[PDB]
């Protein structure tokens, strides 16, 4: 690139901020791509000893969509240490109290279990809604695509689509709906 030695090294090991929307996206699929960016497993210059790592900003974390009945079946448990201090909280209850706890715990368990996990979690920014400080917004570079295609409801289909889809059956005229 004919760069000088100093600016060439700075450009290669630059930090990049990413934006990742969370509107109706499962936290597991949200954490899978977020874990890669935090570690730096997307840079061909990756190495665990090096401090390569990218900030990730996740917005709309109150609107995550757990698949199946995991809102009532999955539980998050912790112990305060004192006797009789074992607390088990359902996924729905935890999300009702701390909006970003579901996503943060999902990522916190997927990163490597070394001592760098504490360091690389500090680069993760979570926001319940689209209320981001202007300082954070000016740092962003690009937005990652949503991992799950959000299905559209019946009222979101245009009248052209409704007429295009064939009518499968012919109901009788004398039936009362």
């Amino acid at each position: 690139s004919s760069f000088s030695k100093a600016p060439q090294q700075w450009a290669t090991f630059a930090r990049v901020w990413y934006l990742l929307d969370g509107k109706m996206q499962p936290p597991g699929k949200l954490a899978a791509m977020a874990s890669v960016k935090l570690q730096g497993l997307h840079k061909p210059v990756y190495h665990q000893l090096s401090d390569c790592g990218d900030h990730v900003v996740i917005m709309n974390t109150r609107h995550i969509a757990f698949s199946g009945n995991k809102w009532e079946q999955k539980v998050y448990s912790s112990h305060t240490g004192y006797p009789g201090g074992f607390r088990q909280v359902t996924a729905a209850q935890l999300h009702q109290k701390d909006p970003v706890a579901i996503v943060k715990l999902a990522i916190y368990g997927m990163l490597p279990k070394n001592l760098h996990r504490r360091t690389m979690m500090q680069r993760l920014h979570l926001f319940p809604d689209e209320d981001i400080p202007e300082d954070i917004l000016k740092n962003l570079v690009e937005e990652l695509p949503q991992p799950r295609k959000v299905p559209r409801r019946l009222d979101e289909y245009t009248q052209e689509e409704i007429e295009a889809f064939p009518r499968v059956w012919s109901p009788p005229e004398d039936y009362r709906l």
């Binding site: 900030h55 504490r118 360091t119 500090q122 680069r123």
Partner: protein, 71 residues
């Protein structure tokens, strides 16, 4: 491409305190204790606070004075 933000600290860089006296380069300092200092740097560089503390004489002395250099 967007135009270069040249005059961003236009007044911050060059501010005249008054037109009767010469400007003063008084860099005020607080010199916070080790406690508040580390938590200021950790928030500044988006790191933890455990690596900003110094180390003992044993680890300092065993570092190589002249590490090999390539290129």
């Amino acid at each position: 491409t967007k135009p270069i933000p040249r005059p961003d600290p236009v007044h911050n860089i060059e501010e005249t305190h008054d037109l009767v006296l010469k400007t003063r380069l008084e860099e005020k300092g607080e010199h916070l204790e080790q406690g508040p200092m580390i938590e200021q740097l950790s928030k500044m560089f988006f790191t933890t606070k455990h690596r900003w503390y110094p180390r003992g004489q044993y680890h300092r002395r065993r570092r190589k004075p002249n590490p090999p250099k390539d290129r």
